[PDB]
């Protein structure tokens, strides 16, 4: 379980006003969004499990996004990106908390695995680090990530339990394609599953076959679930695709 908030200001010459777009995610699914180019300069719900919040929630949230627009690059087609969030396990306890920045999608200043120090990946960003660690931004962020980010994530998980903990099992297939007379590719599919985290591993005769196996990264479907496949090239020969998902009592073994 993870809730992330993204804030980006795509700079514009001539237009004068940088495009500030803000999004919030829970388990990779969007639930809030703000856009300076939108018709109404207010943040909206993009999930049905948060429209239930009262009007004080939105106006409380909308005013905070406006402040972040002014201070997006306070201490930093130029694109400035911001991210923060927290990760949570099935215990519903804190795992890992992030607070990161990028300058044109190159890492600029990122909060370490321990929520205490910053990793300046750009030499221009080391004054930013010297400023923040003198301002103790880490301690103030540690309170929010360990305290506030998790608590509302728990509430969001309760509010959208029909959505976030859906734990759909993968609708799995095995597809075989003859690429040549002497070899073929065996593709094992993972369709309509949730969460996106899945492991598809190939084995020959019961031992791993990583060196000759290709795959594709998990694909968001239009439904709200995800897709993935991994393929191995066989010289014809029986190989097994192991599917490991949260929605399965036992990992599956597939054969052609």
């Amino acid at each position: 379980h993870s809730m992330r908030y993204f804030f980006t200001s795509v700079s514009r010459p001539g237009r004068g006003e940088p495009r500030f777009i803000a999004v919030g995610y829970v388990d990779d699914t969007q639930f809030v969004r703000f856009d300076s180019d939108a018709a109404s300069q207010r943040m909206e719900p993009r999930a049905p499990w948060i429209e239930q919040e009262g009007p004080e929630y939105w106006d409380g949230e909308t005013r905070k996004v406006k402040a972040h627009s002014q201070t997006h690059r306070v201490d930093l087609s130029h694109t400035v990106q911001r991210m923060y969030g927290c990760d949570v396990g099935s215990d519903w306890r804190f795992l890992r908390g992030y607070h990161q920045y990028a300058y044109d999608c190159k890492d600029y200043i990122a909060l370490k695995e321990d929520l205490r120090s910053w990793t300046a990946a750009d030499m221009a960003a080391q004054t930013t680090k010297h400023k923040w660690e003198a301002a103790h931004v880490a301690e103030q962020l540690r309170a929010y990530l360990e305290g506030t980010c998790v608590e509302w994530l728990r509430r969001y998980l309760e509010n959208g339990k029909e959505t976030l903990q859906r734990t759909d099992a993968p609708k799995t297939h095995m597809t075989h394609h003859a690429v040549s007379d002497h070899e073929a590719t065996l593709r094992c599919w993972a369709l309509s599953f949730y969460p996106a985290e899945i492991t598809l591993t190939w084995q020959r005769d019961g031992e791993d076959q990583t060196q000759d196996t290709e795959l594709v990264e998990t694909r968001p479907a239009g439904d709200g679930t995800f897709q993935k496949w991994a393929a191995v090239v066989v010289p014809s020969q029986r190989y097994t695709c192991h599917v490991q998902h949260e929605g399965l009592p036992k990992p599956l073994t597939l054969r052609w």
């Binding site: 908030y5 409380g60 949230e61 905070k64 402040a67 972040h68 103030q140 929010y144 506030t148 509302w152």
Partner: peptide
């Protein structure tokens, strides 16, 4: 919720 403070 958004971070809130500056």
């Amino acid at each position: 919720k958004i971070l809130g403070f500056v």
